[PDB]
Amino acid sequence: KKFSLSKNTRLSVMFRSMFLQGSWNYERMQNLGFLYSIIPALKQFYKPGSEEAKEALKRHMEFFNTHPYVAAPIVGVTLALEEEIANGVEIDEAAIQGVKVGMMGPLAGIGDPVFWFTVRPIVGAIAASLATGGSIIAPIFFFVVWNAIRIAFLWYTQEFGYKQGTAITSDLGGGMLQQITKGASILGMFILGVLIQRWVNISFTGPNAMLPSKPLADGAYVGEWIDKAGKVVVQGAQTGTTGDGVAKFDWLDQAGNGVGNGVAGQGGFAHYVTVDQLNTVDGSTLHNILGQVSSGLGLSPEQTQSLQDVFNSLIPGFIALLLTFLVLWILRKWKNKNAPLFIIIGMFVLGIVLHVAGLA
Amino acid sequence: KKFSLSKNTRLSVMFRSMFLQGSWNYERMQNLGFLYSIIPALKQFYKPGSEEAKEALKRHMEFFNTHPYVAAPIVGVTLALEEEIANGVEIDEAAIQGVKVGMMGPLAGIGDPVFWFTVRPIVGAIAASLATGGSIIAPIFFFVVWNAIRIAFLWYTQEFGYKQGTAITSDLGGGMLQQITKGASILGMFILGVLIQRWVNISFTGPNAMLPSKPLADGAYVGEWIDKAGKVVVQGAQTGTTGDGVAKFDWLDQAGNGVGNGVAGQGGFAHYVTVDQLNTVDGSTLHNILGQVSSGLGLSPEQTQSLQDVFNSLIPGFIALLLTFLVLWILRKWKNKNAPLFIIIGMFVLGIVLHVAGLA
Amino acid sequence: KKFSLSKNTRLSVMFRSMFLQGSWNYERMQNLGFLYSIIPALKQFYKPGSEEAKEALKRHMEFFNTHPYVAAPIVGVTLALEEEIANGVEIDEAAIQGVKVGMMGPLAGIGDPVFWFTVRPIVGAIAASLATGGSIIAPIFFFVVWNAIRIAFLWYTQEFGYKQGTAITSDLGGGMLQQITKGASILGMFILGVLIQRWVNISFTGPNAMLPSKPLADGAYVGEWIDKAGKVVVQGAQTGTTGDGVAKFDWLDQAGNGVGNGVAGQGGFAHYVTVDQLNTVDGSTLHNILGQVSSGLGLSPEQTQSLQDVFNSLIPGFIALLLTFLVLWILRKWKNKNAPLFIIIGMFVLGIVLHVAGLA
Amino acid sequence: MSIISIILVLIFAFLAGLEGILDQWQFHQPIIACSLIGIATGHMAAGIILGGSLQMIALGWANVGAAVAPDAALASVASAILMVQGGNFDLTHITGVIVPAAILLATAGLVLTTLVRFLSVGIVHLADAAAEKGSYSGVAGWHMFALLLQGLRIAIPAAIILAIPAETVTAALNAIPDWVSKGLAVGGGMVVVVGYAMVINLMATKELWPFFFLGFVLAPLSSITLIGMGILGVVIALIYLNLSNTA
Amino acid sequence: MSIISIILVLIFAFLAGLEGILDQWQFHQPIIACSLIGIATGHMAAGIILGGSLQMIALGWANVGAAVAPDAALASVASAILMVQGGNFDLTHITGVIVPAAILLATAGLVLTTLVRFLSVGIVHLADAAAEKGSYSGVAGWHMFALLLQGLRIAIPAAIILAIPAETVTAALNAIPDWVSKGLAVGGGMVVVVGYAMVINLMATKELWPFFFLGFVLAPLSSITLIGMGILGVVIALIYLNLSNTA
Amino acid sequence: MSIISIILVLIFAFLAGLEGILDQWQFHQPIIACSLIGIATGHMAAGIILGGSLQMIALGWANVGAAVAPDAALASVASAILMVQGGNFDLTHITGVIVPAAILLATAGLVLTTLVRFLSVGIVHLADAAAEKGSYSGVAGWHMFALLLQGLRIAIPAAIILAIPAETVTAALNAIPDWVSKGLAVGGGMVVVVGYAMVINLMATKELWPFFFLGFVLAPLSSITLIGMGILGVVIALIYLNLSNTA
Ligand SMILES: OC[C@H]1O[C@H](O)[C@@H](O)[C@@H](O)[C@@H]1O
Ligand SMILES: OC[C@H]1O[C@H](O)[C@@H](O)[C@@H](O)[C@@H]1O
Ligand SMILES: OC[C@H]1O[C@H](O)[C@@H](O)[C@@H](O)[C@@H]1O
C-alpha cells in the first residue's frame, strides 16, 4: 500500500484550500477551488498527462458550492478516498461525488449562520467598539482572533475528516448540528439586541425639540447665597414663617456667626445665585460648590429638558427599537431585491429632514 | 334571517358596556350594567312595551358579577344568542343564563390578578416614577397606555366573543389561562421586589445614628500640602525613614523644583489641609483638586459614617426588606378587616418615634 | 420506663459535642469527642465504676470521623439508642456502631462542601469585603452570622435526630442531599467567579507598560481658550474655511460680544490651554470647567493609556482569569502535596519580577 | 379662587366619583385626579407630585367581590383640594400631612361608598319594577340615576370642602407642629410597604419567591428604568415558561 | 502623495480585491482595509475610525449561494482613498460624506463583481479544456488567472481614483453643503438599523425574541463590555440548552 | 507593651490554638484572630485590615479526612504579633511582608499541628486504659488534656515571639529592601488565585462552569454588594433546580 500522503502534503492541501474561491462561477459554483486544493495529492499519485490524471482532473470539474470554512472535512474525506482509489481498492468513481454532494448541503446550511451571521458580526462589533477611539488594537484584534479561529478550524477539521473517512457522516448526523445552530442563534439575538441599543444613536437634542425650561427652585441646583455687597451666607434655622406666607431664615456667614436675619429671596437679605455671577470663588466657596456637585446638583438655574431626555426616561433605545421594528416590517413586506439600499437612502433623507427641522 | 346587528350597534354596545358598573348592589351584583350594555340590541330586536321586550328585560335582571374589563366576551356571546333567539331558533331561555354563569367565575378569577394586581400596579408605578419630578408626561402616560389597552381589549374581545358564540368555552378552557396567570404572577413578583427596593426610603442619617468619625489619614482625602507661609507643595521620593519612626520626604513646589526637605506633618515643613482652609485656589491647585475628586477622594477630613451607610454596605434595601417581611407576617397572622389601616397608623407613629429619637 | 433524658441534659450534650475534636488522632480519628459529648447521658444512666459503665465507655472508643457540624443528628440518634438500651430493650450492642458507621460517610461527604467550601468562603469573603476599610462591623458580622448558623444547626439537628431515632436514615436517604450539594456548588461557583473578578488586582500601570500618549485634540479635553493677553473666549460660528485648509472662527468673549475674529490655534487669536496654565480661575471660567468635567472630559492634554487600560477595554479581570486557569491547569497536572506553596512562592517571585521590570 | 376653577374642580370631582364605581377611565386614581385638580387651580407640578406620591399607596387598592377597596377617589380629590387651599407645596408638607389626610379620607370614602352601594338596592328594585312593564327607558334612567348618585357621593364633599374659607383651613393646617409633621413624612416612606405587602400576599408561592428576590437584588442597577425592568420581567417570565413547558 | 505610499495602497487594494472573493483573511473588511490604507498614507487613526464606523454597516454583508453581498471591499478601499485625498478627518465629514459614498461604492462594487463572476465561466471552461489533457499546470494557471482578474477588479478602480488630482477631488468634496452633510451624519447613526435588521430577519423565532429583548434591556449596563456581553450570551445559551436538554 | 495586653494576647492565642483543632467558634480565622490581637494591643484598624487581607488567602484552608490544612491559626496569630511589634501599619508593608510571613508561619503551624495530632495517639490510648476501669472522669480529663496540649501548640510560640525585644524585630523587619517589599505586595494580589483555584478544582463540572463565568461577567456591576451577589446566586440556583426538577 504505497502512495501515503504526508503531514506536509496535507498542510499544503490546507493552504491551497484557503483558495477554495476565486474561480467562482454561476453555473458551476466554486469548482476549481477544490481541484486547486487537492492538486498536490493528485500530483503525488499520478504523473501529468496520464489517462489516470485525466480522469482524476475531470472528476472534480462538477458543481460544488459550500461555505468556505466548513469544507476542510470534505477535503479530508476526499483525500482519504483518493488514497483508497490510489491503493487499488474498488470504491466506485461516483462514490466521491456522492459523498461530496451529501455533505455539501447540510454543512453549508450550518456554516452560514454560525460563521457569517454569528462569529463575524460579533468579532467585527467588538473590533469596531475598540476602533471608535482610533486605536490599532482593533484591527489587530479582528485579524488575530478571526485568523486564529479560521486556521484552527480548517486544520483540525481537515485532519478529523481525513482520519475518519466516510464515517464522518455517522458523527455529524442530525440534532448534533441543531444544538450549535440554536446556541449561535441565541447568542446572535442577544448580541444584536445589545448592538441595536448601543450603536443606534438618534439623539434628538437639536435647537428645536427642547421642552420648556422650568425655573427649578432656589437651591435645588448648584449655587451660593449672595447678599447685596458680596459675601456668601448659609440658610440657618427657621425663626417662624410670617403670616404673609414667607419664612424667615437665619443668615450664617461662612464662619459660624450670624448676620442679617432677613427673608430668603431677592428683596430679602440674600438670594440664590449660580456660579456664573460668582466672582473670586477662592476659599471655602469652592469646597461648598464641590460638595454640591458631588451631591448631584446641576449647574443650570433652569432645568432644560429635551425630547431625548424624555425618551431616555421612558427607556434608552426607544427610537432605536421603533426604527428596528419598522425596518423589520418593511423588509418582511417588500420582498424586493434592492430594498435595503432604498431603505438606507430613505433614512439618509430622514436624517436630512430631521436636521433641517431642528429635531435631530 | 332578519335582525342582524351591525358594526355600529356593536360599537355602541361596547361603549355602553363601559358602564357595566354604577348600579352596583350587594345582593344582585352588577346586574343593571349588563342590561344597559345590551339595550341597543334589544331595541333593534323588540319594540318597547311588548311581552317579548318584557321577558328579555326580566331575563337579564339576575346576579352577574365579573371583572369589568373581561366581560366583553360575555357581552358578545350574549349578543350572539340574542340574535339567535330573535331569528326563530329553539335555544332554551335558561341557556344564556347558564353560559353567563359559566364564564362568570373563571374569567373574573383570571382577570382580577392580571388587570388589578399586575397591569395596574405596573402602569401606576411607572407613572409615579415619571411624576416624581412633577412632569405632565406621567398622567399622560398612565391615561394613554391604560385606556389604549382597555379599549383594545374590550373591542377585540367583544368581537371575538360575538364571532365565536358559545364555542368560546372550547377556546378558553383550562391550563391556557393558568399560563397567563403564572406569567403575570412572575412579572408582578419581580416588579414588586424592584418597587420595594427603590421606593421604600427609611434613611437613617439623623442627628443621632451617626457612627464615630475616623480622622482618616493625611492624604486619603481631598486636600493640599500647606507649608507655613502659604504655597502648595507635593510629596517627593523618601530620603530614608529616620530611626525615630518618621519618614523624610521631598517637598516639591508646583514647578518641579525642590524646597525645604523636611518631615511630613504639623511640626515639619508642610501639613495636609483640606479645601476649607485654602485661600486663592486659583492656578494649578484647582487642577490638582479636580484630579483628586475625579479619583474618588472625599472632601471631608473625617470619614463620617451613618447607620444608613452601614446598612447600604450590607445591602441596599435592608430595612425595607425587613419591614416588608414583618408587615407580611402581621398580615397573615392578624386575619382582621381593618388591619391595613392599623398597620399604617403604626408605621406613622413609628416614623414619629424615629424622628424624635434622632434616628431617621 | 425510667432514665429519661431532659432538655437540660440534651443542651449540655450539645455544648459538649461542640468539643467533638481536640483529641484528634491519625489511627482512631475523632473518637474521644463523641464520648465527651455523650458523657452526661451515661452518667445519668450508669454510675461510674460499674461493668455497665465499662461496656458503655469501651463501646464508643472506636474510629469515628465526620464533619463536626453535621454530627448532631448522629449524637441524637446515639442518645436515643442509649435510652433504649437503658430501658431494657433488646437492641444489639453492635447496632449503635453500625448506625454510626452508616451515617458517618454520607453525612461528612455532604457537609464538607456545604460548610467548609460554600458557607465559610462566602461568609469570610463578605467579612473581608467589609474589613477592607478597617471597620469592626466585619469581625462582628463573621462571628455573629457563623455562630448563629452553627448553633441553630447543631441544636435543631440534634433535636431532630433524637426525636427520629434510627428512622432518620429513611428521611436523609439519597437524592435530596444531592440537590443541596448541587445548589451549594452552583452558588459557590458563582461566588468564586465574582471573587476572582473583584479581589485579584494585578494593575499593570507601572512606569513601563505605558502606551504612547496621543496629543488628543484641541478641545476634546478640559481647558479654556486663551488669547495672548489673558481673557477666556469661546469658539463662534464658522465664517468659512479658508482655501489653505484652516477654518476661521468667531471668538466670543464670555459676555456675548465678539472680539478678534482670527484663526484657531497658536498663531491665531486664541489657543486651547488646560487648567494647569490658567491663573485667576475665578468667575464663570470655573462654571465652564465644571460643566466640562461633568460632560466627562479628562484633565490631561495627552490621553495616556496603560496596559491595564487596554486589558480593561477588552474585559475587566482578563489577567485574573488567565492566572486562574493557569493555576488550575498546574494544580490538575502536578498532583503533588506541597504544590500550592510552591505556586504561591512562584507568584511572589513573579510579582517581584513584574515590579523590577516596571510592568506591575 | 377663580369661578372657572371652581367649576373645573367640581367637574373633575364628579368624574372621579363616577370612575370610583366605573373603574374604567381611571379618573379616580391619584395620578389622574390630583394632576387634574392641580391643572384646574393653577399650579400643576404640585398636583402631579402629590398624585405620584399617592399612587404608590393606591397600588393594591382594587375591590373584588363585594370587598370594597379603600377608595382612592375621595382620598385623591379631597387631599388635592386641601393642598390647594393651603398655599404651601414644599413636598415635605405633601408627604407629612397630605398623605395621612389622604389615608383618612380614603377610609371615609370607603364607608361612604359602602353606604351608597347599599342604597343602590332600592334603585335596582325600582329598575326591576320598570322592566316589569317592558320599557327600556325606565331601566336606563334608573341605571343612570344610580350612577349619578354614586358620582354625587364624591362631588358633594368636594363642594363642602370648597365652601370652607381659605384662611381657616390654612390656619388649621399650619397649626400642626413641625416635629409631628417631620415624623409623619418619615413614616410616609414606610407606608407603601403595606400596599406592596398586600399584593405580595395575594400572589406568593415557594416557586415565585425567587423572582421577588431576583427583582430586589437587580433593582440597584439604576441604569435600568422601570419600563426596562418591566420588559426584563416579561422576558424572564417568557423564558421560564418556555423551559417549564419543555417538560 | 509619496510613491511608496502609492505602491502600498495598490498592494492593499489588490489584497482587498482578492479577499472579496476569497473571504478568508478578511483584508476586504473595512476594519482591516481602511486601517491598512490609512497606515500606508500616513494618518492611521482616521483610517481605523472609518473602518470601525463602516464595519457596523458591513455586518450582515455576507454572500450565500449566488446572492452576492453589497461588496464591502470596494466600498472600504475607495472610501478610504477618497478621505485620504481630501485632507479633512473631523469624524463629522467621515460620517456625513464618506459613509454614503461607501454605500454607493458598495453597490457599484456589487455590480462589478457580478460582472466578474459571470465572466469567470469562460475561464473555468478553459480550465476544463486544459484538464481534458490531464495537466495540473493548466488548471492551476487558469484558477490563478481568474483569481487575479477578480483582484484586479478592485485594484484598477483604486489606481483610477489615485490618478485623480488632489485639488479637484478636494474641491468636489468641499462643495457639498453643510446642512446636507449634517443631515447625512444624522442618518449615519440610523443606517446601521438595516444591517442589524437583515441579520435579525435571518434568525428570529418566538422562542428567540425574548433573548433579543433581554440583550436590549441589559445593554445600558455600561460596566459590561462587548466581550463581557459575548460571554454572557454564551453562558445564557449554555444554561438554556442544558435546561432544554434535561427534557 | 502593657502587661494587660500581654495576658490578653496570650488568651487570644490560646483560644486560636484551641479553635485550630475545634473549628467551631472560628477564633483561629484571621478575620477574628488578627482583629482580636489588634484589639488587645491598642490599634484595631490595622488588625482588622490584616484579617480581611489574610482571610481571602485562608479561604479554602479547611482540613478533611486526615489532610490537615495550612493552619490559618498560627499564621494569623504570629503575623498579627509581628505587625504589632513593628510600629508600622501602612497597608503596603502589611501586604508586602506580613502576608508572605503569614504563609510561611502557616506551613510551620501545619507541621506543628501534624506533630501534635500524631502525639495525641498516646493520650487517647491512656484514655482507653482509663475507660477500661469504667471512669468518666479519666476519659474526660484525658480529652481535656489533649485539647489543652493542642491549644498550647499555638500559645507557646506566641509567648516566644512576645519575648523577642521590640528593637530587634523592628530592625529585622525594616532591613527588607524596598523593591522586594513592593514586589511581594504586587504578588499579594495574585496569591489569592491559588486558594480560589483549589476551591474551584474541588467543585467544577461542565454543567457548573457557565455559572462561574456568569458570576465573572456580572461582577463589574459595583452597585451589587457581596451579599447581593450571594442572594443572586441563591435565587439563580433555586430557579435552575426548579427548572431541572420539572423534568
Ligand atoms: O453557503 C453557500 C456559500 O456560497 C459561496 O461559496 C459563498 O458566498 C459562501 O460564503 C456561502 O456560504
Ligand atoms: O372580581 C369581581 C369583581 O367585582 C366587581 O365587579 C369589581 O370590584 C371588580 O373589580 C372585581 O374584579
Ligand atoms: O470530613 C472529615 C472531617 O475530618 C475532620 O473531622 C475535620 O478535618 C473535618 O473538617 C472533616 O470534614
Domain boundaries, chain B: 7-199, 216-301, 307-356
Helix residue ranges, H only, chain C? 7-17, 32-45, 51-59, 72-85, 93-111, 120-131, 137-164, 168-172, 176-199, 284-295, 307-314, 318-334, 339-356
C324/F143 Cβ within 8 A: no
Task: Look up cell 454530627; give the residue.
Answer: C71
Closest-CA residue to E178 (of C252, C238, A204, A344): C238
Tallying the residues shown for chain C, one arrives at 360
Give the HSE-up count for residue E233: Cα atoms under 13 Å, Cβ half-sphere: 34
| Position A69, amino acid | Y
Separation in Å, CA A140 to CA A127, A148, B166, D187, F145: 9, 12, 68, 59, 68
Q: Residues lining ligand 2, judged by CB closer than 6 Å?
A: B 30, 65, 67-68, 108, 112, 116; D 23, 62-65
| Position F31, amino acid | I
Chain B contact present for D165, CB below 8 A: no
CA of A238 to the centre of ligand 2 (A): 50
Residues 6+ apart with CB under 8 A from C260: C227, C233, C251, C269, C270
Cα–Cα distance measured from residue C125 to residue C119, given in angstroms and rounded to the nearest whole number: 10
Closest-CA residue to A124 (of E117, E53, C225): E53
| Mutate which: C234, C287, C292, vs A, most A CBs within 10 A | C287
How many other C-beta atoms are found inside a 10 Å radius of the C-beta of residue C202?
22
Cα–Cα distance measured from residue F9 to residue F37, given in angstroms and rounded to the nearest whole number: 6
CB C189 within 8 A of CB F208: yes
Q: Cell numbers of B339, please?
A: 388591619
Nearest-CA distance from C276 to chain E in Å? 27
F121/C25 Cβ within 8 A: yes
Q: Cell numbers of D160, please?
A: 363642602
CA of E65 to the centre of ligand 1 (A): 5
Q: Cell numbers of B74, please?
A: 360575555
Q: Cell numbers of A17, please?
A: 484550500
Estimate to the nearest angstrom the gap between the alpha carbon of F187 and the chain centroid: 19
Cα–Cα distance measured from residue A332 to residue A340, given in angstroms and rounded to the nearest whole number: 11
Cα–Cα distance measured from residue C358 to residue C205, given in angstroms and rounded to the nearest whole number: 9
Chain E contact present for D234, CB below 8 A: yes
CB E73 within 8 A of CB E17: yes
Q: Which residues of B touch C296 (CB under 8 A)?
A: none
Task: Look up cell 462587548; give the residue.
Answer: E226
Pick from F232, F235, F243: which is nearest to D243 by CB? F243
Cα–Cα distance measured from residue A321 to residue A343, given in angstroms and rounded to the nearest whole number: 16
Cα–Cα distance measured from residue D69 to residue D57, given in angstroms and rounded to the nearest whole number: 12
How many other C-beta atoms are found inside a 10 Å radius of the C-beta of residue A214?
14
To test ligand 3's pocket by mutation, which of C66, C110, C119 has the most ligand atoms within 8 angstroms of CB?
Answer: C66
A286/C290 Cβ within 8 A: no
Strands lying side by side in the sheet with C224-226: C251-253, C232-235, C224-226, C271-273
Which chain D residue has its CA at the smallest distance from E239's CA?
A: D243
Cα–Cα distance measured from residue E123 to residue C109, given in angstroms and rounded to the nearest whole number: 72
Helix (H, G, I), strand (E, B) or coil at B303: strand
Closest-CA residue to A130 (of A139, A122, A121): A139
Q: Which residues of F touch B218 (CB under 8 A)?
A: none
| CA-C24 nearest atom, ligand 3 | 6
How many other C-beta atoms are found inside a 10 Å radius of the C-beta of residue D3?
7
Estimate to the nearest angstrom the gap between the alpha carbon of A121 and the chain centroid: 6
CB B352 within 8 A of CB D186: yes
With both helix axes pointing from N to C terminus, report the angle between D136-163 and D3-22 in degrees, rounded to the nearest 10. 130
CB C30 within 8 A of CB C20: yes
CB B87 within 8 A of CB B3: yes
Q: Rg of chain D over CA atoms, in angstroms?
A: 21
CB B130 within 8 A of CB B141: yes
Cα–Cα distance measured from residue B326 to residue A136, given in angstroms and rounded to the nearest whole number: 58
* DSSP codes, C178-223: HHHHHHHHHHHHHHHHHHHHHH------SSSSEEEEE---SSSSS-
Region of A280 please: left (phi>0), alpha (psi -120 to 50) or beta: left
Cα–Cα distance measured from residue F102 to residue F72, given in angstroms and rounded to the nearest whole number: 8
Taking the alpha carbons at both ends of chain B, their separation in whole angstroms is: 75
CB D222 within 8 A of CB B346: no
CA of A72 to the centre of ligand 1 (A): 14
Cβ(E63) – ligand 1 distance below 6 Å: yes
Taking the alpha carbons at both ends of chain A, their separation in whole angstroms is: 75
Which helix (H) or strand (E) segment holds residue A120: the answer is helix A120-131
- Way it was determined: cryo-EM
Separation in Å, CA A269 to CA A123, A232, A316, D57, D88: 64, 11, 44, 41, 22
Which helix (H) or strand (E) segment holds residue B6: the answer is none
Residues 6+ apart with CB under 8 A from E70: A340, A341, E61, E103, E106, E107, E109, E110
Q: Cell numbers of B162, please?
A: 360575538
CB C37 within 8 A of CB C20: yes
Cα–Cα distance measured from residue C27 to residue C50, given in angstroms and rounded to the nearest whole number: 28
Chain A contact present for D2, CB below 8 A: no
Q: Which residues of F touch C126 (CB under 8 A)?
A: 226-227, 230
Q: Cell numbers of C148, please?
A: 448563629
Cα–Cα distance measured from residue C82 to residue C5, given in angstroms and rounded to the nearest whole number: 10
Cα–Cα distance measured from residue F243 to residue B66, given in angstroms and rounded to the nearest whole number: 35
To test ligand 2's pocket by mutation, which of D63, D114, D117, D150 has the most ligand atoms within 8 angstroms of CB?
Answer: D63
A320/E187 Cβ within 8 A: no
Cα–Cα distance measured from residue A328 to residue A191, given in angstroms and rounded to the nearest whole number: 17
Closest-CA residue to D235 (of B86, F157, E206): E206
> Ligand 1, atom 12: nearest CA belongs to which residue?
A67
Cα–Cα distance measured from residue F36 to residue F44, given in angstroms and rounded to the nearest whole number: 8
Cα–Cα distance measured from residue D29 to residue C116, given in angstroms and rounded to the nearest whole number: 54
CB C193 within 8 A of CB F213: yes
A350/E215 Cβ within 8 A: no
Task: Look up cell 463572476; give the residue.
Answer: E117
Cα–Cα distance measured from residue F72 to residue F53, given in angstroms and rounded to the nearest whole number: 13
**Would you list the domain boundaries of chain D?**
3-190, 204-247
D202/B344 Cβ within 8 A: no
Q: Cell numbers of C249, please?
A: 472662527
Helix (H, G, I), strand (E, B) or coil at A226: strand
Cα–Cα distance measured from residue A127 to residue A142, given in angstroms and rounded to the nearest whole number: 6
CA of C109 to the centre of ligand 3 (A): 9
Q: Which residues of D touch E211 (CB under 8 A)?
A: 235, 239
Q: Which residues of C touch A222 (CB under 8 A)?
A: 290
F225/B314 Cβ within 8 A: yes
Pick from C286, C294, C313: which is nearest to A281 by CB? C286
How many other C-beta atoms are found inside a 10 Å radius of the C-beta of residue A197?
20
What is the β-pairing status of strands B224-226 and C232-235? unpaired
**What b-and-e string marks burial along C306-330, b requiring 16 or more CB atoms within 10 Å of the CB?**
bbbbbbbbbbbbbbbbebbeebbeb
